[PDB]
């Protein structure tokens, strides 16, 4: 059932996905936004678009609909063009991860372009290094200097020149196992830092609420004075700590000067001895906290769904396929395994390749979440 299942299951799923993934991913190609901050997303857009454009020939080939010439064209061109785009898409995910790590965890790294990294230079260099410097086999795949191999069948292994593709397809995996492991350090360091920032904010607001309660229960000038001093210290500490968090909380540095304002006023109303009126001023801060957490819980949702969006897609699209490939090559080397297990594992490999190519349809999630200009364009569309 090896010859019939692949047209039945893999081909059907791929044909279902081609009509939707490219249609959903071609929207971001306009990019009437950004200049030197988002361009990594646009590079992923173009790589994904080329992926989906090259997809249809795969179903044309593996389903037996195309002739031997179509199979040869698929082997020589479509497979390589899809692979190079997928393995540059993973690299560009890793580069977005690098930007996210560098711009939130430590202040400066410096580069030839911009403060975080040379976005334009890296974007120009990575695609050039991937297209031909990583897979020279584009014109060097002129069959095995001979066609007419199993007629329409066995129209893939036909390649001359020691078939260096085997060397080129291992490294394509190997660099991924760097990028993936990179995401084990870029992200994870970006979760510890974010969690520390949120814990610092929560502790500051805890002590702020405690001192506000002390003010509401206070009796003379000394208690109000001490509580407002502690609350001002907490407000300043929270203002400083919020700057070390995610960039999706910029207004947090812009509203605290109001909070730390009214405490100061209340402070002047406690120092001067007017404790009985000072309390009233601190009562206004009770409306500050209610007006703050109502946004805080609204933005910690936004950050967590953003900072964990990419690590979601990368861990659902590309990682499962690279896990599944290891037994495939291992049992290619170890022929002692059963051939039925070989067939089932081939089915698993092609299904995981479909899952990885589903990053084309899953990338609109990243476009909608991580890009505020994309949100504005979608709203105004």
């Amino acid at each position, epitope marked *: 059932i090896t010859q019939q299942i692949i047209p039945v299951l893999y081909c059907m799923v791929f044909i279902a996905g081609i009509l939707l993934n490219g249609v959903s991913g071609w929207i971001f190609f306009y990019v009437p936004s950004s200049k030197s901050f988002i361009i990594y997303l646009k590079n992923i857009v173009i790589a994904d678009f080329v992926m989906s454009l090259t997809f249809p020939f795969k179903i044309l080939g593996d389903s037996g609909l195309g002739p031997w010439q179509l199979n040869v064209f698929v082997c020589r061109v479509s497979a390589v063009l899809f692979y190079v785009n997928m393995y540059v898409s993973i690299v560009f995910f890793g580069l977005i991860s690098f930007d996210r790590y560098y711009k939130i965890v430590k202040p400066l790294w410096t580069s030839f372009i911009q403060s975080v990294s040379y976005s334009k230079l890296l974007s120009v260099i990575v695609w050039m290094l991937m297209l031909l410097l990583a897979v020279p086999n584009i014109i060097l795949t002129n069959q095995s200097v001979r066609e007419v191999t199993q007629i329409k069948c066995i129209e893939l292994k036909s390649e001359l020149g020691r078939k260096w593709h085997k060397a080129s397809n291992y490294i394509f995996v190997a660099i991924f196992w760097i990028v993936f492991l990179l995401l084990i350090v870029f992200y994870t360091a970006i979760t510890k830092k974010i969690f520390k920032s949120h814990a610092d904010l929560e502790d500051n607001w805890e002590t702020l609420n405690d001192n506000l309660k002390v003010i509401e229960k206070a009796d003379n000038a000394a208690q109000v004075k001490d509580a407002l001093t502690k609350m001002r210290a907490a407000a300043l500490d929270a203002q400083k700590a919020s700057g070390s968090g995610s960039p999706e909380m910029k207004d947090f540095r*812009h509203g605290f000067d*109001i909070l730390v*304002g009214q405490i*100061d*006023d209340a402070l002047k*109303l406690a120092n001067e001895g007017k404790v009985k009126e000072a309390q009233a001023a601190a*009562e206004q801060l009770k*409306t500050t906290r209610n007006a703050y957490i109502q946004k805080y819980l609204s933005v910690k949702k936004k950050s967590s769904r953003n900072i964990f969006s990419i690590v979601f897609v990368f861990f659902v699209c590309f990682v499962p396929y690279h896990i599944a490939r290891i037994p495939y090559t291992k049992s290619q080397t170890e022929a002692h395994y059963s051939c039925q297990s070989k067939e089932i594992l081939r089915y698993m490999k092609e299904f995981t390749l479909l899952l990885s190519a589903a990053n084309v349809c899953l990338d609109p999630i990243i476009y909608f979440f991580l890009c505020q200009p994309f949100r504005e364009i979608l709203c105004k569309k």
Partner: antibody
Amino acid sequence: QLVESGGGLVQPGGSLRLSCAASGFNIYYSSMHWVRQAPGKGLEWVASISPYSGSTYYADSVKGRFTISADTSKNTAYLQMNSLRAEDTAVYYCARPWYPWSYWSGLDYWGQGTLVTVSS
Amino acid sequence: SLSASVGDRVTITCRASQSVSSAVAWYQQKPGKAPKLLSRFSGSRSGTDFTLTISSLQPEDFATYYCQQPWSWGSALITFGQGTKVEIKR
């Protein structure tokens, strides 16, 4: 009661100091706000100062360009506008809440308002 | 802008996403004068909406009404609404 003065025709990019003199109370134990109403438009809050503690708040549209200070000796709140743009044309009202923190009421007491026209 | 004749009950609605207590100040600016902070005038709330009800209109109540949208008081930040103008029905 609050009386504003100093409004008039100024060219774009110029500076102007509107003086809101307060009568019947001292501005030290108070907070003075400026609310500008563009011709035919709704009210817009501009700046606020609490001379007791010295805290000063600004609208996001005018932060830095304007500067509000107070002088309790003359009992006057001065809004100094620098780098005035064409959209700064408006009637500026000097509002003052009942309490310096206003409790909940809002800008209870308002001035007569004075016109500022920024046109070349 | 809305229209209502003398003696009609009127409801002016201001939109704000805050869910804090109804500490929304309503200003009645008669044309050509400074605004006035606001027994017929009564406050109310309906979800995200803050409502000013005039039980019985009077000839001096045909003015523009501005709310001070919620979160208008950590001491300062006074975001007035776009204003509802009450006219005559004729």
